[PDB]
Design an enzyme around this catalytic site. Structure first.
Site, PDB file in Angstrom:
ATOM      1  N   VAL A  31       0.857  -1.188   0.000  1.00 34.07           N
ATOM      2  CA  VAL A  31       0.000   0.000   0.000  1.00 34.07           C
ATOM      3  C   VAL A  31       0.895   1.240   0.000  1.00 34.07           C
ATOM      4  CG1 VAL A  31      -2.083  -0.985   1.080  1.00 34.07           C
ATOM      5  CG2 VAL A  31      -0.224  -0.101   2.553  1.00 34.07           C
ATOM      6  N   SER A  32       0.408   2.339  -0.569  1.00 34.46           N
ATOM      7  CA  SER A  32       1.145   3.607  -0.530  1.00 34.46           C
ATOM      8  C   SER A  32       0.845   4.395   0.749  1.00 34.46           C
ATOM      9  CB  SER A  32       0.850   4.458  -1.767  1.00 34.46           C
ATOM     10  OG  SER A  32      -0.538   4.710  -1.893  1.00 34.46           O
ATOM     11  N   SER A  33      -0.304   4.108   1.359  1.00 33.37           N
ATOM     12  CA  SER A  33      -0.738   4.754   2.600  1.00 33.37           C
ATOM     13  C   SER A  33      -1.636   3.823   3.421  1.00 33.37           C
ATOM     14  CB  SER A  33      -1.480   6.058   2.290  1.00 33.37           C
ATOM     15  OG  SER A  33      -2.683   5.799   1.588  1.00 33.37           O
TER      16      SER A  33
END
Lengths: 124, 124, 124, 124
Positions: free
Chosen positions: D8-10
């Site tokens: 995930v990026s965040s």
């Protein structure tokens, strides 16, 4: 410079038609080979053509099967030209060099077009 | 006559730019729809546009993804237009209304390209 | 029911093997034709086969090239069967008709592979 | 051994769900990374996962976009796994077996599908 590569497996094939087609698209020097398309390892004349072309040149064949009858090897050869910044043109499919969408879509579509043609070449 | 179909999911998606693009490519009337491209079932404006065009007409979109994001339905729509003798024009793909080189291989590859773009459109 | 179409240009081809393959894949009748694949117009047995099959049937061939060596005509025949609601099975590509539930491996894949093989059949 | 890679990026995105998806498809060890998919150069956990797997292993992701949002680098990564004889599986599109029934056609089609997914991933 615009360079052509011509190949026949035997003299029965219409080599002159192939040469005329390359000339039509402006090939100034043509490397002509009498060999099968099965392997790149046994084609010194193709190797000379590939070593001859430089950044900014155009490399023309009548069809991708002239480059080779092996999907993997054709892809390897196209990648070489790509790396060397030499444009590949196929006289039987001059649509291939037209830009489709943004740089991402275009490179992806060109990848697919080449793979489709390389697959056809081997499947034949 | 030339008839345009324009589509956005939301008015945030610069519909202006899409409309002026169809206007530039000669659309005399533009059918504009605010809806997802996932389905033709909930797109009455697309249905109206397809109903409107007849033999000899041109049906224009900016890109395949405007026509839809559903491989099966987009190909069905392309085939509907072909059957109705309405020429599909894609403003970002002017090659589709041209025949260059070997007419057969040209048609073959352009056909696959349309399919690849329709698939990409659904995948997106 | 399952119906086969077998074709050779010459009796020196392995027609027995082709028939044996169609039988193995469950053909209940095989329409057998000795003719070139270049044209449908001179192939009354293919026409008999296409006339025989009806909605719900399966039409089987060993390979696409048996159906024809003419891209436009093979696609036309494929589209005819689709519109007649007759499933086309190619015994040499048995996994084609298995429904995955994703266009990438279903309709998209089938469309691409059928079209490639149809072009290959003509270009060979 | 079956190994997963999750990204995930965040922490706004549902990481728990992605992990459970990989476990559902039998991942024994999962390498989990919180980083953008834009580059492999700042993703040491991906490098560890790739270094971890060996010939005969399976490397799984929920979707190609988890693996990366960079066409070139995803292709490079998939090629790396190929050369290492590590099976790649996308849980949202499992393609470990033959999808057609012919080695050239299967290789071609898998290559084509991966390229579609890798291109879309970057474009998004």
């Amino acid at each position: 410079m615009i360079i052509g590569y011509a190949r026949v497996s035997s003299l029965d094939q219409n080599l002159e038609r192939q040469l005329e087609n390359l000339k039509t698209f402006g090939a100034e020097k043509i490397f002509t080979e009498k060999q099968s398309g099965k392997s790149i390892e046994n084609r010194p004349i193709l190797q000379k053509a590939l070593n001859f072309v430089e950044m900014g040149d155009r490399f023309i064949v009548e069809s991708i099967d002239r480059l080779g009858r092996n999907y993997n090897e054709v892809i390897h050869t196209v990648n070489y030209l790509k790396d060397k910044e030499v444009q590949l043109m196929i006289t039987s499919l001059p649509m291939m060099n037209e830009v489709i969408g943004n740089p991402l879509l275009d490179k992806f579509m060109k990848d697919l077009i080449i793979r489709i043609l390389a697959m056809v070449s081997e499947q034949e």
